[PDB]
Amino acid sequence: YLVG
């Protein structure tokens, strides 16, 4: 995933 990629943080947010």
Next chain:
Amino acid sequence: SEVDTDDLSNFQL
């Protein structure tokens, strides 16, 4: 320390 510019000049970076 002898340097020739011409011999370098044709070099292609």
Next chain:
Amino acid sequence: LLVTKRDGSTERINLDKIHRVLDWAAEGLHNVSISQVELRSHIQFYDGIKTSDIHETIIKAAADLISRDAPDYQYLAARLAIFHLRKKAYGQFEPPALYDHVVKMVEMGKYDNHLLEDYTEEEFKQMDTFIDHDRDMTFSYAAVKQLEGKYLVQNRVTGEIYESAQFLYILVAACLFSNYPRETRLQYVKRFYDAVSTFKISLPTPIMSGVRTPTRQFSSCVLIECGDSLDSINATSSAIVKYVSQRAGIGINAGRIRALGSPIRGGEAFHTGCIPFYKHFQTAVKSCSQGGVRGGAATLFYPMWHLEVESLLVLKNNRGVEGNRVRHMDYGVQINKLMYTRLLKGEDITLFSPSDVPGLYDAFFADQEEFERLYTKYEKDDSIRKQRVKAVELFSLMMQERASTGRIYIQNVDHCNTHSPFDPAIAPVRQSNLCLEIALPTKPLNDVNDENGEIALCTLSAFNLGAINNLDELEELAILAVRALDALLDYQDYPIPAAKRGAMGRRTLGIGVINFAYYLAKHGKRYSDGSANNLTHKTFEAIQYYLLKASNELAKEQGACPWFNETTYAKGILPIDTYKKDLDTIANEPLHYDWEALRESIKTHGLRNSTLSALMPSETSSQISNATNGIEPPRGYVSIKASKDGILRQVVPDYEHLHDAYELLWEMPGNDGYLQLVGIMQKFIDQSISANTNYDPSRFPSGKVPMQQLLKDLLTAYKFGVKTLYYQNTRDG
């Protein structure tokens, strides 16, 4: 007749016990003679001989026979030394049970107590079954000496040695993976352990000697960028003192400091020079050394167009006034395309003070178009203070000093930012480290604790190319390597806030290789003829692919690094998209991996780490694993090293079958072959390489390296996209 033991009580000599010991150690070795060893050591025996001495004597005797004709003495000596250390630490050959050991060590305060908190008694019992204490028998004498010398946990005052190799390895694993979920933790522990104990993965000294003990300091090199202000100079200097005290190598960027003569505050005071501050950074660096000598190394960087450049270049030249000399620091001159162009056309170079040319410094790294635009404009602008020099003289002076000292380094800034993992507009690379292989972004501090500064760190490791059978074994290795180093960043301590910022922000790694020469020799290739080009392209493709893959997998599991959005990787750009296009003419190996499928995955799930690979030199690490140093070719078939216990000899790996396949350093006719291989490596490396240039005066007329040839090699390097240039070896037998 008459030996004394450790309690200091006399027993008679039984000379067949010794014999057995030797007999055992020799098991499986070829061309070693037990008799020879017995002869040379028995003669030095005497009534009242301590037992310990008996071991030292046979070890030395065995060790003194190490040669190219009988290389197996390496292992005979080693095993005898392993044995001795076993007895020295445990009191018997057989190592205690893991749990008991840890417990005892924890009570003595040599191991971190958290180990007993993180792992249960049953868990330690399980780990014990992984350990194979017989791996200790694969070490070479030189390796054992390194182990005994700086890795194993000991009491340096008393000389007591408390552990053995296998415990080191297993506990290093345990600590790095201690936070993993219980359902995987130990599976990783075992896998890592196997990798490192069978020399597949190599680890830096700080880690090996510290991880498992109470300390938390593990970084070996730091990068500090200094601002053009007394506040920032002071901060910088403070940081250095902190970090050198923890035995760290420093890399300083002091290019922004204005030039001597420059106006301060208006016209109320005129600048003093950079020199005075460089001297102050030197004293900072040497602050914790014996006298002002031993230890603390640093490499300072500055642009080649700085106005004081001619005074900076000769800072090491011994022959000169002390006042204008900062002798104990290495320097890195920053060059870009424009500078080389001026040299080729035989024109002039204009020198400026950073302070007087707004936006020039920033453009220099981030945008070559703009740099050029402003550089030309300012050249004409008469208001700007400036000074012209012939391109040829400037270059000549730099090469001269580089040749004389061998410590005047080059950094091609443009290459560093056009072919990098970072976006130059957001986070440009503007300096390198001590050994010129690290390339990370930095921001200057305005105080030691300033929270908005950035300080880059060297988190390293390496793959042993002599230990893998096929490139597809790297997949697993990459997984362990990336995972253990990522966990280390969260395990270690950060003295200055600015160093924690970069570490947590971008989570950068620097993984490279060892045993390259040996690897080439096995494949029947050489450095100088270009026979290795396609194999090197294929090897480094695999390495980088699997590292990126492992980071991507980790990203899915634990989340991409916070500042992932400043990377080129985040915009779907890979190393294969931005490399220097001339490489296509020196290698045709095709890509064997699915880079497009990975491109997507990175774009979608990001990367855990912003940078992954870097090719650092490695003396110690290579010795433990009996391997050739990093990518460098070996100087000879036998390496010699001095120690208090005697002369240390190490024979190149598989000399017996490969002596003729090796290509030694001074066997190379020139630097072309090596420079091409270096450039091919740089196509996939995220960061940089510690490339060297070697010259042998005997091959030149009158024993004098021609200036025409030093510039030739310099341009070649640039042409194939080399980012940095380290040492310059000038052989003198």
